[PDB]
């Protein structure tokens, strides 16, 4: 059919350190800033809640949100070319070759994803400047040589039940089933493809399949990251539990579980979205395979 939503594309900086998603808050680091919002909620000697949230965190979210919107024009240009290359009936209403329309898709796609990074470069530098402010805000803790780890382990236990809400095993079952169907569908198109008849339906299948592989590749990335941070903090839930540490150690404690938890929430957003994107692509491939096998009396490939 038609891909009505191309939210599955992402991009990262050249250092591969910051990952931009089209879903809010576009950066996992924003989820970590919200966790410090909850970390200071339990440390009563910190009343800088309004300063970090209103003056910094929420305005970075809006600037990233605005930067994503600047690329909406390039976003729809890419979708328009996807709907032509995946749809033989639509491709037949236009006049240019399949290789010509295919090259435009490659150019427009790189222009779109590149827009997601270029418009967000100044927002990414703001992330490192905020990271330092949470360390400074945690330095205002009244304690120093002995800092209770009560809140740090209270947050860990709350994180364990938040992980239960996510269906990891079914997500694992899902990606293994569709990846297996994807590979066998790709290998079969290799064998059945020929060049004596009109190759427009084989072309649309291969095009959709290549996007299927990209979605599968991204799904496995997030599923692995989610599993990592889950196993890590449950290990900390079973890992050594001092009733007190020095304020420098408690700072990296909050930064450890805060990073782990923010990757979880970021993965949950992306995995729920990539799940629908892959399902929609698979249904298009099967609609295309029906066209390929719909006129057995005439020809196939």
């Amino acid at each position, epitope marked *: 059919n038609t891909t009505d939503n191309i939210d599955y594309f992402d991009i990262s900086d050249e*250092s591969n350190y910051y990952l931009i998603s089209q879903l809010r808050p576009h950066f996992s680091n924003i989820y970590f800033f919200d966790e410090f919002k909850r970390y200071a909620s339990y440390h009563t000697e910190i009343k800088r809640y309004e300063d970090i949230h209103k003056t910094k965190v929420n305005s970075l979210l809006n600037e990233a949100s605005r930067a994503i919107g600047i690329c909406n024009r390039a976003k729809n240009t890419v979708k328009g070319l996807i709907n032509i290359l995946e749809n033989p009936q639509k491709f037949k209403t236009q006049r240019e070759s399949y290789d010509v329309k295919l090259r435009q898709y490659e150019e427009k796609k790189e222009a779109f994803r590149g827009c997601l990074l270029n418009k967000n470069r100044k927002n990414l530098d703001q992330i490192k400047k905020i990271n330092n402010e949470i360390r400074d805000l945690l330095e205002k803790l009244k304690c120093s040589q002995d800092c209770q780890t009560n809140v740090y382990f209270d947050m860990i236990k709350i994180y364990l039940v938040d992980f239960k809400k996510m269906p990891y095993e079914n997500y694992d079952t899902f990606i293994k089933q569709y*990846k297996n169907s994807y590979l066998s569908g790709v*290998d079969m198109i290799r*064998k059945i493809e020929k060049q004596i008849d009109n190759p427009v339906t084989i072309n649309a299948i291969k095009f959709t399949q*290549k996007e299927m*592989g990209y979605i*599968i590749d991204r799904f496995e990335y*997030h599923l*692995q990251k989610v599993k990592h941070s889950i196993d890590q903090v449950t290990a900390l839930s079973d890992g050594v539990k001092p009733k007190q540490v020095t304020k420098n150690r408690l700072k990296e404690y909050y930064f450890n579980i805060g990073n782990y938890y923010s990757i979880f929430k970021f993965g949950k957003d992306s995995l729920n979205m990539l799940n629908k994107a892959l399902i929609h692509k698979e249904k298009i491939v099967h609609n295309l395979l029906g066209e390929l096998f719909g006129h057995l009396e005439e020809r196939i490939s």
Partner: antibody
Amino acid sequence: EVQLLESGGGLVRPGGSQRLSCAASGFTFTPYAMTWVRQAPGKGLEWLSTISGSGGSTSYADSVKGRFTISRDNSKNILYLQMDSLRAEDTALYYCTKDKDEYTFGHNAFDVWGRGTMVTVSS
Amino acid sequence: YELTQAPSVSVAPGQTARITCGGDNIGRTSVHWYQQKPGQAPVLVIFYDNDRPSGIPERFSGSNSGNMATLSISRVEVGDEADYYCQVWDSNNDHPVFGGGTKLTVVG
């Protein structure tokens, strides 16, 4: 133009460790699945491990499963193979190779190969 | 999955060499062929049963059907002396697998 260059293999004791690397150049390294293949002297090709483009999936052969670890750095175009608990039978020329296309997870032909690095496990 | 290859094949110059790749219903999956000359890396010579990379001589052709895949080299030159490996995807264990290899020796 597309190049793969293995490095890091040398003499190593039984039970020791050794890290192999493969430096890629000339193509978009991230969307491709990368694979390690070793070849004992005078023997045949043996598939060892494959890793997805993003690193979300990894597979191993039983002969090295539990001892070897494949990984990649998509910012520097480098494929890695960390070999622990090396045994004498691991003596081989270790090849770097690449899927012909993107997003095929090793279910493809291997069009570009490096020239390999010699790993010699001996006491 | 296991791939069966004969250890050796002998041909005369100008003849047609044939190297076999056996496997249970191997015709369901793609077979790839690699040429390895001594002291060199493998070179992809035939992929997807019968597709030929640009730069490989037309003397290299491929066929895969039933339980037998075959790589055939026509008008064999002395420079064709190498080891030839076939490879398929193991659909039960989900990983690539290589045959034992076949050494081609050009006689005469």
